[PDB]
Amino acid sequence: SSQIRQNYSTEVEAAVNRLVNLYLRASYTYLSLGFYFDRDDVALEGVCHFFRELAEEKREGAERLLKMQNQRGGRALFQDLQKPSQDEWGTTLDAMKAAIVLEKSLNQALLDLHALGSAQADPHLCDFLESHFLDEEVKLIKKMGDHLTNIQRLVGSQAGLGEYLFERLTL
Amino acid sequence: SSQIRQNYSTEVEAAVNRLVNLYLRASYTYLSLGFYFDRDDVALEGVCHFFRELAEEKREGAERLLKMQNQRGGRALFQDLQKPSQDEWGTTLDAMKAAIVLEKSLNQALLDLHALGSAQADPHLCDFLESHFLDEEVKLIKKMGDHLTNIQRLVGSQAGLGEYLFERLTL
Amino acid sequence: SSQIRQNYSTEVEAAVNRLVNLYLRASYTYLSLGFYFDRDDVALEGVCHFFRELAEEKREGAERLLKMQNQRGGRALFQDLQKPSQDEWGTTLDAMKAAIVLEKSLNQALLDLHALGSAQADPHLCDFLESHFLDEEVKLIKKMGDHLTNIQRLVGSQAGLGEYLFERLTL
Amino acid sequence: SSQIRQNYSTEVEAAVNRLVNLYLRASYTYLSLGFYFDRDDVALEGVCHFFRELAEEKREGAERLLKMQNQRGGRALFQDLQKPSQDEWGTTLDAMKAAIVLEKSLNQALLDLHALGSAQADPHLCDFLESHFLDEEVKLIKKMGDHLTNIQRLVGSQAGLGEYLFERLTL
Amino acid sequence: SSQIRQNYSTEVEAAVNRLVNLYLRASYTYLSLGFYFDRDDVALEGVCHFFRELAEEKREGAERLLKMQNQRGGRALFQDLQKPSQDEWGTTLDAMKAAIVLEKSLNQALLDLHALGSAQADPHLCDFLESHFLDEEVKLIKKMGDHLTNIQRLVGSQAGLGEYLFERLTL
Amino acid sequence: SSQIRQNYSTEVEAAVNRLVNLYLRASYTYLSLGFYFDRDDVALEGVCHFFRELAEEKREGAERLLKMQNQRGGRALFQDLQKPSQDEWGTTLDAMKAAIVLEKSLNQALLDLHALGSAQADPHLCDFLESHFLDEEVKLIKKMGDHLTNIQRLVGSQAGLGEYLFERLTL
Ligand SMILES: [Cl-]
Ligand SMILES: [Cl-]
Ligand SMILES: [Cl-]
Ligand SMILES: [Cl-]
Ligand SMILES: [Cl-]
Ligand SMILES: [Cl-]
């Protein structure tokens, strides 16, 4: 039992460890998406770079949650990281749809945890999510929605052409 | 129905559009106050500049609310902008009293919307108001109260003299 | 009655206040067009930026007219600002057509006021419109006509593709 | 009754004045701890500097609370500052334990006030504590817990040696 | 009993601890005066800054006395800090009169302690007061007397006007 | 079947994907070791930093293997990442022993894969391991052996003292 722990519920502690698992899983998914778009038979470098950058952001999320865990006197506990849901990710469109689905699930986890922190009267947890995750997630989802719209407008008749142009002129 | 929208109530969406209307109305009021104090028969440049600067701040408020609207997947809807409540604004004192009344009504709108966001369990809205409006509004109201006190001390016997001196040495 | 006013007709004064209303209305229209193209389901950033920049130019127009009003000893009077004619603006093409219609109506207001100033023998008003509005308006209308032509050439068979390319390579 | 005060409960106002008293009392305690470790018969300069720096941080806390008090239109009221609980503070270990006890009581005061602000629907107070105190307090308590652990590992057989080494290589 | 203490009377040691209490009390008084003049209904920023700066100087005085205490091998002992004599400080005039009364009492404490050090044949104490307090106190009292005279000349018929002008053009 | 693949055996391809799994698992282990030594009740910052840096190096290893996979025309395939073998890592000594065990198993995987590449007559694979992994691994193992020796010499009678000193003066 901790020298520092104050106002830090076991329920929050545990949900924080699950969120770390989710973020790491997200990182892994993006590592898989990034290297799929680096395949010689896919070869969309801008799409590759976009997903690799998200791998990194999601790893950094987990790391910030682990630091906060320790700052509040909780105990990091790690679980198995499950492999991404797919081994091949189809088109840029398919991939960006899967990424928005993923982000909406991270975002709902963030909101679920905020609500718990709020029911537990844990304002530092609530602020920590407010300052470092909730707005970042909103901005990212807006950006992906923006991309989806542009990808979709570009499919038209000429899907290859549109995929090339999006990668070259937007990403 | 939106690709991005998550945890964003129609009630919040609508209140955000009304707040945009309020901020724009406030901007307009300050544009009118600014140009009244630029009249050759009023000629108080420091008072002019103070109100023009607030016109600009309130426009920027509306713009930030419109951006957030889009970031959450809501739909901006614009209404008629009603003209300022007055065509002539009297003394610096009169004007600063009207500006504090205006700001207290914007501030109560902000607090009403925070409360709604809080009842709707919308922590991103609550944080967004916290980070960009509530403290800014408090600081502005403090500053106007400070000015009012100084204007009032300067009326004394010699109202013209006091109005000149306030504009020259404070604004 | 004014210490400074000379050769400044009540007819000009009033038409100047109406032109201010028109410019502000134009600004508002462009604010609405700008945020429509920032929607996640429209997502054309170059179109957004083009219209936001015009919001700003039209606000600055009104501000210069209000300053001149005061410089000539007239009295600024503000009216209700009516909401933009549309809540959704369709394609880039639709939007640019609406913007040219708007600008042609501002331009005819400018010319109507010049003619009045000319009938009233008010050379300072005539010069002020000449120096700060008439050429600026011509240049803007030329630019919009240029854009319209390019948008139209790009519709061809492939409307999404053409809308993307115009926004990416021209705006 | 105030020209500026809005949504600022007498209950919050009073609790803010008590928190100011607590922070100042904390400052005083740290001033006493700092000068005890500057005694020629204690002579641990790094421990001295650590506590003097906290004296300063806690004074600055009180000052920020007094500023906010005025910004919200409340009235600062000062009380007697009670002397520190001890005139001599024993070992570095003893001192750091007393400092963690102190900080946990400041931290619980902060949380109590946040809860009150939350029950009173006072989001500006809640944000102000979130932005300037709650995380700072968590970080400080983590740091003191870190120090305690290191002090404790160093006692072992050789308490003087461990106290010297901690002061020389950590503080 | 001290390894370092030489020619340092218990009578001096104790009077030094009382002087520390006096200086801290003075600091507190000035902290209260500073925040009173930051009230929105008082709003005299130059008066605020003048008193806050004295809060700081008097804290630094106490700190230098505590350092010397330790340098001579005496033992710092802290007492209760009594609250300022007033919760509201009236006009700038009232406040500056109270500050001169306060400073004259600090100054008489300094002189009383010098006399004791002189009777005890403690030249280092006498020099320490000479080098760091007696002249500083004289200069401060001269400055406050200068301010009082200027405040008094400005009351005349027009007290608000004079209070504003003093704060704007002198402080 | 690949446009680029030449002299790249399915046996190598598969072993490369398993090595990626091993490196990622190693990264995870080091992430867990790093945050254990950041606990307030462990508090050895130099040990924390040493393991976090290895988390990063092992992630970069996996990333370089995934890039090479794609460069040779193989297909990255990801598996479940198993959780670290321990939730708590004991002393610095315990941790460094576990890290050397881990590295010896990575190193044997590297050598096993080199041998396979050598039996398959795949000189590019052999060179790639030579240039980017085998020497790096040797250097790291030497460094850990160096650390182990120093940790062990420092246990002596005084284990806490030795753990503190190693972290402060070596890491
Ligand atoms: Cl799975
Ligand atoms: Cl109206
Ligand atoms: Cl209308
Ligand atoms: Cl007491
Ligand atoms: Cl008292
Ligand atoms: Cl396992």
Short mmCIF file of N, CA, C and O in Angstrom, two decimals, chain B residues 142 145-146 149-150 153-154 157-158 161 165-166 169-170, chain E residues 38-44 158 160-161 164-165 168-169:
data_model
loop_
_atom_site.label_atom_id
_atom_site.label_comp_id
_atom_site.label_asym_id
_atom_site.label_seq_id
_atom_site.Cartn_x
_atom_site.Cartn_y
_atom_site.Cartn_z
N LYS B 142 -13.12 41.49 -14.96
CA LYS B 142 -12.29 42.13 -13.92
C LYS B 142 -11.71 43.46 -14.40
O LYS B 142 -11.76 44.45 -13.70
N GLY B 145 -14.48 45.99 -14.68
CA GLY B 145 -14.80 46.49 -13.36
C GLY B 145 -13.73 47.48 -12.86
O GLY B 145 -14.07 48.46 -12.16
N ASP B 146 -12.45 47.14 -13.09
CA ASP B 146 -11.34 48.03 -12.74
C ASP B 146 -11.53 49.40 -13.41
O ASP B 146 -11.40 50.44 -12.76
N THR B 149 -14.42 51.60 -11.98
CA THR B 149 -14.08 52.20 -10.70
C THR B 149 -13.27 53.46 -10.91
O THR B 149 -13.56 54.50 -10.31
N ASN B 150 -12.28 53.37 -11.78
CA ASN B 150 -11.45 54.51 -12.15
C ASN B 150 -12.23 55.61 -12.86
O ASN B 150 -12.04 56.79 -12.56
N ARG B 153 -14.33 57.28 -10.05
CA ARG B 153 -13.56 58.16 -9.18
C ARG B 153 -13.26 59.47 -9.89
O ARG B 153 -13.14 60.48 -9.23
N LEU B 154 -13.14 59.46 -11.22
CA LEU B 154 -12.73 60.63 -11.96
C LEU B 154 -13.89 61.54 -12.29
O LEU B 154 -13.61 62.58 -12.86
N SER B 157 -16.33 66.35 -9.60
CA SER B 157 -16.97 67.62 -9.94
C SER B 157 -16.86 67.90 -11.44
O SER B 157 -17.70 68.60 -12.00
N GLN B 158 -15.85 67.26 -12.08
CA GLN B 158 -15.20 67.75 -13.28
C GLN B 158 -15.26 66.66 -14.36
O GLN B 158 -14.24 65.97 -14.58
N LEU B 161 -13.02 66.68 -17.73
CA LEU B 161 -11.64 66.54 -17.33
C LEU B 161 -11.35 65.08 -17.02
O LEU B 161 -10.37 64.53 -17.51
N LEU B 165 -8.80 62.51 -18.96
CA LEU B 165 -7.67 61.93 -18.26
C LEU B 165 -7.67 60.42 -18.26
O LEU B 165 -6.64 59.86 -18.56
N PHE B 166 -8.84 59.81 -18.06
CA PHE B 166 -8.95 58.35 -18.14
C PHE B 166 -8.51 57.81 -19.51
O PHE B 166 -7.78 56.82 -19.62
N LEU B 169 -4.61 58.53 -19.82
CA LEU B 169 -3.62 57.92 -18.92
C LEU B 169 -3.86 56.44 -18.63
O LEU B 169 -2.97 55.76 -18.08
N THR B 170 -5.07 55.96 -18.89
CA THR B 170 -5.36 54.55 -18.72
C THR B 170 -5.53 53.88 -20.07
O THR B 170 -4.90 52.87 -20.22
N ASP E 38 -5.79 45.80 -5.45
CA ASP E 38 -6.16 45.01 -6.62
C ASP E 38 -7.66 44.67 -6.67
O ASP E 38 -8.14 44.12 -7.64
N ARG E 39 -8.46 45.04 -5.67
CA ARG E 39 -9.90 44.81 -5.74
C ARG E 39 -10.48 45.60 -6.91
O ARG E 39 -10.06 46.75 -7.16
N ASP E 40 -11.51 45.03 -7.57
CA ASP E 40 -12.15 45.70 -8.70
C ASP E 40 -12.79 47.02 -8.26
O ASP E 40 -12.87 47.92 -9.08
N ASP E 41 -13.17 47.15 -6.99
CA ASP E 41 -13.79 48.37 -6.48
C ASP E 41 -12.79 49.32 -5.82
O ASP E 41 -13.17 50.24 -5.12
N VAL E 42 -11.50 49.08 -5.98
CA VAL E 42 -10.46 49.96 -5.50
C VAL E 42 -9.58 50.28 -6.70
O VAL E 42 -9.54 51.42 -7.14
N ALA E 43 -9.01 49.25 -7.34
CA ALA E 43 -8.43 49.30 -8.70
C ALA E 43 -7.39 50.40 -8.89
O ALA E 43 -7.53 51.34 -9.71
N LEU E 44 -6.33 50.32 -8.11
CA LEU E 44 -5.22 51.25 -8.19
C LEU E 44 -3.96 50.43 -8.33
O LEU E 44 -3.31 50.12 -7.33
N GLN E 158 -10.70 67.67 -4.78
CA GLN E 158 -11.01 66.72 -5.84
C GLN E 158 -10.34 65.38 -5.53
O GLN E 158 -9.28 65.08 -6.13
N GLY E 160 -10.92 61.91 -5.56
CA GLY E 160 -10.84 60.86 -6.58
C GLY E 160 -9.80 61.17 -7.67
O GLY E 160 -8.97 60.32 -8.00
N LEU E 161 -9.89 62.38 -8.21
CA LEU E 161 -9.00 62.86 -9.25
C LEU E 161 -7.56 62.78 -8.76
O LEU E 161 -6.71 62.25 -9.46
N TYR E 164 -6.29 59.17 -8.44
CA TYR E 164 -6.00 58.62 -9.76
C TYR E 164 -4.68 59.15 -10.26
O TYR E 164 -3.83 58.41 -10.70
N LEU E 165 -4.50 60.46 -10.20
CA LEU E 165 -3.31 61.07 -10.76
C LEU E 165 -2.04 60.65 -10.07
O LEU E 165 -1.10 60.31 -10.76
N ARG E 168 -1.23 57.16 -11.25
CA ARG E 168 -0.84 57.11 -12.64
C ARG E 168 0.50 57.79 -12.83
O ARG E 168 1.25 57.31 -13.66
N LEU E 169 0.78 58.94 -12.18
CA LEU E 169 1.97 59.72 -12.55
C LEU E 169 3.15 59.57 -11.60
O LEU E 169 4.28 59.98 -11.93
#
